[PDB]
Amino acid sequence: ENRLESILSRFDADWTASDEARREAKNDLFFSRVSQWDDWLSQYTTLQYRGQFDVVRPVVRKLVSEMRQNPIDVLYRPKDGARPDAADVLMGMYRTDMRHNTAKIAVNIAVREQIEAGVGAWRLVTDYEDQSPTSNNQVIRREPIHSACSHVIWDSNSKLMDKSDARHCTVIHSMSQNGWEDFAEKYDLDADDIPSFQNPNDWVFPWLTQDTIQIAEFYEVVEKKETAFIYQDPVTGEPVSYFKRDIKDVIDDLADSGFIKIAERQIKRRRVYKSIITCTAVLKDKQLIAGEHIPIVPVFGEWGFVEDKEVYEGVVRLTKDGQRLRNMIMSFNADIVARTPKKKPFFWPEQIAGFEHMYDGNDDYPYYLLNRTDENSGDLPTQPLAYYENPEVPQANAYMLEAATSAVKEVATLGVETYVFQDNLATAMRRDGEIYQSIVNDIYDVPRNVTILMAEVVDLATGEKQVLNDIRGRYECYTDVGPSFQSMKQQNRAEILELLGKTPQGTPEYQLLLLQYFTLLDGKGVEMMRDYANKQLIQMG
Amino acid sequence: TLAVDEIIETISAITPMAQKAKKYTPPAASMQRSSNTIWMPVEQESPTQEGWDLTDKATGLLELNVAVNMGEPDNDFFQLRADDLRDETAYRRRIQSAARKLANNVELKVANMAAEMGSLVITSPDAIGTNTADAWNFVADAEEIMFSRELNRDMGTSYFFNPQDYKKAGYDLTKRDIFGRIPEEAYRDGTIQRQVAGFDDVLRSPKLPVLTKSTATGITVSGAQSFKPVAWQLDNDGNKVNVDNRFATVTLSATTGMKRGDKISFAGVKFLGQMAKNVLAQDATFSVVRVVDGTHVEITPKPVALDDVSLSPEQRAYANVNTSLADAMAVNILNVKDARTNVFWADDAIRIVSQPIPANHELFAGMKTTSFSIPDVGLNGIFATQGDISTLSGLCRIALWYGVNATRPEAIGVGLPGQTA
Amino acid sequence: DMGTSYFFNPQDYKKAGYDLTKRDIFGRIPEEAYRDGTIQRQVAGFDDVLRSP
């Protein structure tokens, strides 16, 4: 019955289910990021040489570079039979609030972890920006998530790569004392009661200090039929607005402005609630957030289900054996070179007695003198001179160094190319576009395009607050994947050039050239060219 | 022999007194020659007269001073064998522990000097858990004695309890059979309150000293002794040299069983109102700083007597005691039983002078010297490394050169509960 | 730094709650110890006070 106990039961089930893959991904990250000698169980014996001879980091660097040269972003396109410009406002807002450094950095981090460990993730959050707001004094920003394998825990009963059918996710936040103070200040929590949770990190590397204040954010999705109010638009048509979104704020201000209620229906929709929890108490209970989806977007590498359990793999999990073997063999051979006697003669002391300054390595003498006689045996025994044999690397060591290097080279080839990984990133971007569109419908001011113009229908409440009024004709555009531009003007320029490339030198070629000059940035010479092109377009009808 | 890198944290120290102590950093180039001493004036006090015709009664001017100096470095010299794995493993954590222990030493020194040079003494014949609101009685007695002596408290005040008496005060609060704000806070958390009885900072300190009972019995003053506030005096060569205003040497019948930090009071001698020179109802209390010879001591407040006749009027204007020493008066001890000390002071009573160690100079080749900020306390030291092969090792030394100084020993105090027997 | 815990046996927990409830006053803490059996989650500075069966 206890809410905390139910949440914790879900969390333990998911934790146990993901135990194997999470630990493997953490090991992969450690291998490719800190040290390949994951030998954290040490011994007090005399120190032994342990070198690192990487042959997997160049491949990882090549793959991350290859994915970096091919940026991918969300592209909203109008639905079938919808208005030809149904995605203009949504695409403009997306390019407005995803052009910052945080979005690009989050996607880059997720991609790099997808290559190395096997899974990454990022998050979408809403904030109140009072200086440069996207709409309704708010912005939507994309935040990174580090070590998604151990810090983002999904619903265990989710069999979709993008986790759209996951119905609850728990994110673990770990901080130091100052970070905890800031977290409490930001979420209006108590800074005196230091939280605690399941620590997702291991002290495997000597780190002096490690952050030890943990908390969790538990998002859940609930789908139900709730009330929607059918109104009549004072301009034209009839809108539909959800009862919860105007329950008390403008429930009478709509009528006072001039909306007349017509009908009351029951429409099914998903609501997302966030709770802030620790291992012993629930801090925030069910704070309702924006969107119809969980705001975490995961990116996977090689993802699948073996037998009712998920396995995700990158490029490193299958080279660890050969790389460890190569490091071990090279360490052994370095030991051979260092701690081994050199090639020097074998002497009896009596053979060189009295001449031991002739053999110390100087070159003051033209030859080497020896002794022949002894006073008891008469003459010294005459044996062929012997030398210590030269150090040598065994054929086994050479063969296995070559074989392990060859094996790692052979395994560490993703595909033939990163087409599958970029397609999985495109899947993540489509899911992110879905989530962002839903969040936009929830918190932004989405105007409607009338064929009579671009009309906004909104009103203020008695407390001076403005509550957005959005019709149910909202999912008019779907999500595709295209190149990453910084603004709609850039996207339009790219479209114009793309058309120009395939258009032969007829009249449309002149049209598109004038259009390209029309959509150019401003100096003085380019200003003159754009003025000329605008005048020509106007005069040509 | 499997081993891990997760360290089992075992101790955690808190150093509040060294935080509250203001830190002073005078110029090192001048301090090299001044013999690590720097002098400061003392707020002037003026005499007054009555009447119309006051010919030949014009006074001079007399401005006293105190001196602040410093002691010796505090180091963590240790040696690092380059082959021992157990030395290779623990070196950086040894540096961390060095920083922690250096800070602990600093604040322990602050506490010891504050307890051993605090002139104001607030004793009680019973423990703090005996009656109701007797912890508040202690704190209010400290506040009252400061107010009556008219000492400056503009920068602030502080009262440090030891954990024993902090818990006693908390018990006194929660035994109240009511629960409002103060008792409810003292129940849910141990904290009694942040301000008590006029002090604007009441804390608990885990390393306040325990002041041993003195063995002195039946000690009397040998000869009348009048002490005169002077700013300098002639030496054997005719050179004028300065005088510390915070010491007086008293010749007693026998200084046996008297040690540094013992608290005494002379019978009949009474406090004064400082500025107004109105006698109080409380005996003047002194703290013996040094037991020099076997018949002399050095008490940290100078007993300048108001009724003294050999003082110039500007010197009498500095009187903090109603009557002088009378060749027979009994000096009675005040710490007659072992008891940990609660310590109160005005925040401007103790300072921490600090100096640099220029071992980064080009004179010291072979050594690598860097700066090393001591955490918690606001102090800087040096971290010096020098390798060796006479033993195939390396030497690491973390040095810190500072010195605590009680500039106003009469503004510091000690609370002594259970001073019976 | 990782928190401190106190654990009462049920008998001493009842005696502690009785100590709170016999208090001739009902402000907030005796009222909690009356309506519920709990004394309080934090006592005398300890970060968590529980009852161990």
Swiss-Prot record, chain A:
<protein>
    <recommendedName>
        <fullName>Portal protein</fullName>
    </recommendedName>
</protein>
<keyword id="KW-1160">Virus entry into host cell</keyword>
<keyword id="KW-1171">Viral genome ejection through host cell envelope</keyword>
<keyword id="KW-0167">Capsid protein</keyword>
<keyword id="KW-1188">Viral release from host cell</keyword>
<comment type="function">
    <text>Forms the portal vertex of the capsid. This portal plays critical roles in head assembly, genome packaging, neck/tail attachment, and genome ejection. Procapsid assembly may initiate with a nucleation complex composed of portal and scaffolding proteins. The portal protein multimerizes as a single ring-shaped homododecamer arranged around a central channel. Switches upon genome packaging from an asymmetrical conformation in the procapsid (PC-portal) to a symmetrical ring in the mature capsid (MV-portal). This change of conformation may serve as a signal for headful packaging.</text>
</comment>
<dbReference type="GO" id="GO:0099002">
    <property type="term" value="P:symbiont genome ejection through host cell envelope, short tail mechanism"/>
</dbReference>
<keyword id="KW-0231">Viral genome packaging</keyword>
<keyword id="KW-1162">Viral penetration into host cytoplasm</keyword>
<dbReference type="GO" id="GO:0019073">
    <property type="term" value="P:viral DNA genome packaging"/>
</dbReference>
<keyword id="KW-1244">Viral short tail ejection system</keyword>
<keyword id="KW-0946">Virion</keyword>
<keyword id="KW-0426">Late protein</keyword>
<comment type="similarity">
    <text>Belongs to the p22likevirus portal protein family.</text>
</comment>
<dbReference type="GO" id="GO:0019068">
    <property type="term" value="P:virion assembly"/>
</dbReference>
<comment type="subunit">
    <text>Homododecamer. Interacts with the terminase large subunit; this interaction allows the packaging of viral DNA. Interacts (via C-terminus) with the head-to-tail adapter protein gp4; this interaction participates in the head completion. Interacts with the scaffolding protein; this interaction initiates procapsid assembly, thereby ensuring incorporation of only one portal ring per capsid. Interacts with the capsid protein.</text>
</comment>
<dbReference type="GO" id="GO:0046798">
    <property type="term" value="C:viral portal complex"/>
</dbReference>
<dbReference type="GO" id="GO:0098006">
    <property type="term" value="P:viral DNA genome packaging, headful"/>
</dbReference>
<keyword id="KW-0118">Viral capsid assembly</keyword>
Curated annotation (Swiss-Prot), chain C:
<comment type="similarity">
    <text>Belongs to the P22 phage major capsid protein family.</text>
</comment>
<comment type="function">
    <text>Self-assembles to form an icosahedral capsid with a T=7 symmetry.</text>
</comment>
<comment type="subunit">
    <text>Interacts (via N-terminus) with the capsid assembly scaffolding protein (via C-terminus); capsid proteins and scaffolding proteins form building blocks that assemble to form the procapsid. Interacts with the portal protein.</text>
</comment>
<protein>
    <recommendedName>
        <fullName>Major capsid protein</fullName>
    </recommendedName>
</protein>
